[PDB]
Amino acid sequence: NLYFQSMSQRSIIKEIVITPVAFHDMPLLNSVGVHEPFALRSIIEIITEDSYGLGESYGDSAHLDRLQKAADKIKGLSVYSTNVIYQRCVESLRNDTNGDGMGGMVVTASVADKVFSPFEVACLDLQGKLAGISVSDLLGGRVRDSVQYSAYLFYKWGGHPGDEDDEYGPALDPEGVVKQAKKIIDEYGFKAIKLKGGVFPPADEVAAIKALHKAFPGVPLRLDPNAAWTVETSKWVAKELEGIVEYLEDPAGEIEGMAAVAKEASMPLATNMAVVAFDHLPPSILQDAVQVILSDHHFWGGLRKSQTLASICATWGLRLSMHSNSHLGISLAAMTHLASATPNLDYACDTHWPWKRRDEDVVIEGALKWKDGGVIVPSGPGLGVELDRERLAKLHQQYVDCGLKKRDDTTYMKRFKPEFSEKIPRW
Amino acid sequence: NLYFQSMSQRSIIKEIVITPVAFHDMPLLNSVGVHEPFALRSIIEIITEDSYGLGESYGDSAHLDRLQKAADKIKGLSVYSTNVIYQRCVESLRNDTNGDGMGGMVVTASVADKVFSPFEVACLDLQGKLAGISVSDLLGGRVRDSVQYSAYLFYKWGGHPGDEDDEYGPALDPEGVVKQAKKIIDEYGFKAIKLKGGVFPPADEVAAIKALHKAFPGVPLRLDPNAAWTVETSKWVAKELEGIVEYLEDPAGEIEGMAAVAKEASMPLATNMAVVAFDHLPPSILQDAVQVILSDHHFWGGLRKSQTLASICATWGLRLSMHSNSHLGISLAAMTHLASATPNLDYACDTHWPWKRRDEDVVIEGALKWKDGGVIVPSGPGLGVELDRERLAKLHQQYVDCGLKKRDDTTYMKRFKPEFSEKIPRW
Numbered sequence: 001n002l003y004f005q006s007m008s009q010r011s012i013i014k015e016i017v018i019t020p021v022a023f024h025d026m027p028l029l030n031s032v033g034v035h036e037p038f039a040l041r042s043i044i045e046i047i048t049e050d051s052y053g054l055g056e057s058y059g060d061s062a063h064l065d066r067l068q069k070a071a072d073k074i075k076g077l078s079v080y081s082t083n084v085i086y087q088r089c090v091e092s093l094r095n096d097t098n099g100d101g102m103g104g105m106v107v108t109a110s111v112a113d114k115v116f117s118p119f120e121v122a123c124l125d126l127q128g129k130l131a132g133i134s135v136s137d138l139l140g141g142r143v144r145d146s147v148q149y150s151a152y153l154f155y156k157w158g159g160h161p162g163d164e165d166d167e168y169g170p171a172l173d174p175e176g177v178v179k180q181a182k183k184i185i186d187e188y189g190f191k192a193i194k195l196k197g198g199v200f201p202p203a204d205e206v207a208a209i210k211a212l213h214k215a216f217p218g219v220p221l222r223l224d225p226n227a228a229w230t231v232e233t234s235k236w237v238a239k240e241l242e243g244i245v246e247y248l249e250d251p252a253g254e255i256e257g258m259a260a261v262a263k264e265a266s267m268p269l270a271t272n273m274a275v276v277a278f279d280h281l282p283p284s285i286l287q288d289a290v291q292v293i294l295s296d297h298h299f300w301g302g303l304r305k306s307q308t309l310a311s312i313c314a315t316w317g318l319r320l321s322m323h324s325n326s327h328l329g330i331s332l333a334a335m336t337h338l339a340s341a342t343p344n345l346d347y348a349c350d351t352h353w354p355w356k357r358r359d360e361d362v363v364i365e366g367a368l369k370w371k372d373g374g375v376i377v378p379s380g381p382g383l384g385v386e387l388d389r390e391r392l393a394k395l396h397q398q399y400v401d402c403g404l405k406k407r408d409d410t411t412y413m414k415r416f417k418p419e420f421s422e423k424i425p426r427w
Numbered sequence: 428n429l430y431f432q433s434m435s436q437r438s439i440i441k442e443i444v445i446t447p448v449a450f451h452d453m454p455l456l457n458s459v460g461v462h463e464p465f466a467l468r469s470i471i472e473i474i475t476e477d478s479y480g481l482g483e484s485y486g487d488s489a490h491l492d493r494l495q496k497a498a499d500k501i502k503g504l505s506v507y508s509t510n511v512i513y514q515r516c517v518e519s520l521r522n523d524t525n526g527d528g529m530g531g532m533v534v535t536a537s538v539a540d541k542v543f544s545p546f547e548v549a550c551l552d553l554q555g556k557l558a559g560i561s562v563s564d565l566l567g568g569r570v571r572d573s574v575q576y577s578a579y580l581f582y583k584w585g586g587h588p589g590d591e592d593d594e595y596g597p598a599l600d601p602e603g604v605v606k607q608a609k610k611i612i613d614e615y616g617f618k619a620i621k622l623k624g625g626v627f628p629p630a631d632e633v634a635a636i637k638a639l640h641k642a643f644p645g646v647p648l649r650l651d652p653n654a655a656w657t658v659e660t661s662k663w664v665a666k667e668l669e670g671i672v673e674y675l676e677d678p679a680g681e682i683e684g685m686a687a688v689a690k691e692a693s694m695p696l697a698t699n700m701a702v703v704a705f706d707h708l709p710p711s712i713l714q715d716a717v718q719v720i721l722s723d724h725h726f727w728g729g730l731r732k733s734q735t736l737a738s739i740c741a742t743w744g745l746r747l748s749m750h751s752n753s754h755l756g757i758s759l760a761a762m763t764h765l766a767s768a769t770p771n772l773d774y775a776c777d778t779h780w781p782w783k784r785r786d787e788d789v790v791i792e793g794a795l796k797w798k799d800g801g802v803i804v805p806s807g808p809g810l811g812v813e814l815d816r817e818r819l820a821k822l823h824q825q826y827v828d829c830g831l832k833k834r835d836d837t838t839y840m841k842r843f844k845p846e847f848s849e850k851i852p853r854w
C-alpha cells in the first residue's frame with residue numbers, strides 16, 4: 001500500500017547520462033581490415049530518485065545521437081515500462097534514414113533493437129536493485145552458477161605500426177595461433193576455442209584449425225571467416241574440417257549461401273550475420289539455412305528479447321550460442337546473467353576479454369571473477385556491478401583524446417595496405 | 428545488502444495448497460455435449476514466510492494429482508526460480524502416461540505447460556507483492572488501462588433437466604441467440620461477439636450469425652464450431668459469411684484441414700485446437716494453416732510463456748487473441764494483466780464471466796471492475812486480487828458435495844440423449 005506507492009515514484013526515470021569511452025585495443029585481423037588502437041563504447045546510466053542502473057552499447061557517433069534522442073523521450077517513464085520504452089525508441093527513429101558500429105560485419109540488425117538494448121539492460125539492473133534481487137532471477141533464475149566462455153583467437157600484427165609489440169606479439173601462421181591460444185588458456189582456462197578467419201587463404205586457416213586440434217585434443221573448435229568464402233570454397237572447407245570443429249560460423253554470405261552450404265556440411269553452421277534480427281528468422285527457418293544462432297543482446301534488443309530468441313530456437317530445434325564485440329564490464333555482467341538463466345544456451349559464449357587491458361574498465365573492481373573458463377554469476381542485486389566514476393572519466397578522457405568517432409577497421413588497414421580490399425566473398 | 432538477504436528468504440516457497448472448487452454452470456451447448464451443473468477448478472496458493480501468491484487451473488482429478496506431485500518437488504525453491512520450477516514439473520511427469528479438463532475439445536496441449544502454468548502465475552503474483560509492483564509491470568508494463576472482452580454466446584437449454592429455467596432461459600434459434608446477446612451486452616457492454624457453434628446444422632448457425640450482424644451493426648462477430656465441419660462444409664460456411672465475421676475459429680480439424688480451408692476463406696482462421704502448444708507452431712507456419720492464435724496461459728505455460736507465443740506471432744505475422752474456459756477471479760486477473768502488457772493482443776478476449784453466478788468466486792470482492800466491455804487492469808501489487816478464504820471453503824464444500832470429479836459434457840448429454848454423438852466432424 002504505502003510500499004507500492006513509494007515504489008511507483010522510486011521507479012521513475014529522472015535522468016539518463018550517455019558517456020562515450022575508449023579503451024586500448026590490439027591489431028587483431030579480420031575479414032574487413034584490422035582493429036584500430038582504440039575500441040569505442042557507450043555507457044548508459046539511468047538515474048532514478050535514489051538509485052541508478054547501467055547498460056552498455058556501441059560508441060560510434062551516429063549511434064550516440066540515436067541513443068540521446070531516444071533518451072530524451074524515455075525520461076519520466078517507470079523502469080518497468082519496457083513496452084512503452086521500446087515504443088519511444090521506435091518513435092525516435094521515425095525520421096532516421098541517416099554504419100554498423102561493428103566494423104561492417106553485422107549490417108542488417110534492427111536499429112530500434114540496437115537503440116533499445118542498453119536502456120532495457122539499465123532498466124533490469126534497476127528492477128533488480130529496487131526489488132533486492134539479481135538480474136538472473138528476473139530472467140527466471142540461474143540454472144548454472146558460472147557461464148563458460150571461449151578463447152577467441154585472432155591473427156594479428158605484433159603491435160600497431162610504429163609502436164612496440166604488445167604482450168601477445170604476432171600470430172600469422174598456425175604456430176603463432178597455437179602460442180596465442182596457450183597464453184590465453186593458461187590465463188583463463190577456457191574450454192573451447194574460436195579462430196577469427198577470412199584473413200588468410202582458406203587452406204592456411206584450415207591448417208591453423210588442425211594445428212589447434214592437435215595442440216588441444218578434445219577441446220571444441222570453431223572457425224569464423226565472416227562470409228569471406230564462396231559456396232564452393234565453404235563446402236571444401238567443411239569437408240576438410242569434418243569431425244574437427246564444433247561448428248562452422250558464417251562461411252558463406254546470406255541466408256541462401258548458408259543454406260546451400262548447410263546441405264553438404266556435416267557440422268552445424270552458426271551465424272551472427274545472416275540471422276541478426278527477428279525478421280530474419282522466418283526465411284532462415286524456411287530454407288533451413290543455419291543450425292546455430294549466436295545471440296547478442298546488444299543488437300537483438302536486450303536481455304528479455306534474447307530469451308525470446310532462445311525460445312524460438314528451442315521450438316524450431318536450433319541451437320544457441322553467444323556473439324561478442326570488444327566490450328567492458330557492464331556488458332560482461334549482462335551477458336553472464338542472460339546466459340546463466342537461459343537453459344538452452346549451452347555452447348560456450350564468445351568474449352574479447354583477453355584482448356582488453358586488465359586495468360581498463362568502467363565498473364568497480366572485484367564483482368566479476370573468472371574461474372575454470374567461466375564467469376561466476378554475480379550475486380548481488382541488479383547486474384551485480386557498480387559504476388567506477390573515476391574510471392569512467394578516465395576512459396571518457398581517452399575517448400576525447402584519441403579522436404576516434406566510429407569503428408573503422410577497413411580505413412585503418414588501408415593506411416598501411418592501401419590496396420587491401422574488404423569486399424566478400426574473397427576466396 | 429541486508430535487503431537482498433531477507434529477500435532471498437522472503438522469496439522461498441514454504442508450502443503449496445491445492446484446493447478444488449465447484450461453481451454453478453448453465454446448460455450451454457457445444458460440439459461434444461452440454462455443460463454439467465457445476466464447473467470444476469483448482470485454486471493454487473503458494474505460501475512463503477510472510478506472504479502468498481495465487482494461481483488457478485483445471486479441476487479434474489488426474490490434473491489435481493499432477494499438480495500435487497509437482498508441488499511436492501517445488502517446495503524450497505525461490506518464487507524467482509521459474510526455470511527450475513518448470514524442470515521440476517517436467518521431472519514430476521517422468522512416469523506419467525496416465526483427459527483434457529476441457530471437455531475433450533483441447534486434447535493436444537503440453538501437459539508440462541498445463542501443470543506449470545498455475546505455479547508460474549502464483550510466483551508472479553508473489554514477485555509483484557515482494558517488489559510492491561503489479562504483475563502487468565513485471566510483464567513490461569500495461570499499454571492499455573483496461574482489456575476488452577467479447578460476449579460469448581451459446582445455444583442452451585432453458586435450464587438443467589428437472590430444475591427451473593435459469594435467468595437466461597433457452598437459446599435454440601437465431602432469435603434466442605439475439606435475445607441472449609442483448610441481455611449480455613446490456614449488462615457488460617462488450618464490443619465484440621462470439622457464438623459457440625457445432626451444435627446445429629451449419630445452415631442454422633450461419634443464420635444466427637446473420638441475425639446477430641443485423642441486430643448489432645458494426646460489432647465484430649466470430650463463430651467457433653470446434654472443428655465440427657468437413658473441409659468442404661467449412662469452405663461453404665466461409666463463403667456465406669464473407670465480410671460478416673472478424674474471424675472463423677476452428678471450422679475444420681487438424682493443421683491440414685485448417686490450411687486447406689484458409690486457402691479459400693477470405694476471413695482469417697483462428698484456433699485453440701490445431702495450435703495449442705509450441706510444438707504446433709512449426710508445422711502450422713509451414714502450411715500457413717492459421718492466421719490467428721487464441722492464447723490461453725492455462726495451457727501454454729503461464730504468463731511469460733504466453734508473451735513468448737505473442738512474440739512468435741508478431742515475428743511470423745500472425746495475430747493473437749485469447750481463449751477462455753469457465754473460470755474464476757484469479758484467472759480473470761491473470762488474463763487481464765497478461766493482455767494489458769501484450770502490445771499485439773488487440774482482438775477482444777473471450778470470457779465466460781456472464782455464465783457464472785455473480786456471487787460465486789474465490790477472491791475478495793471489488794478488485795475486478797467492468798467498464799465499457801473491459802476489465803480495468805488491477806492496480807495493486809501482484810495480481811491485485813486477494814483470496815477470500817470463506818468463499819474458497821464454500822466453493823470447496825460445493826466441490827465435495829456435488830461429487831463431480833472431471834469435466835464431462837458428453838456423458839452428461841448422453842444421460843438425456845443417449846443417441847448423441849460427440850465425434851467430429853459431423854456436417
Ligand SMILES: [Mg+2]
Pocket residue numbers: 224226249250271272
Ligand atoms: Mg561471427
Ligand SMILES: [Mg+2]
Pocket residue numbers: 651653676677698699
Ligand atoms: Mg475455440
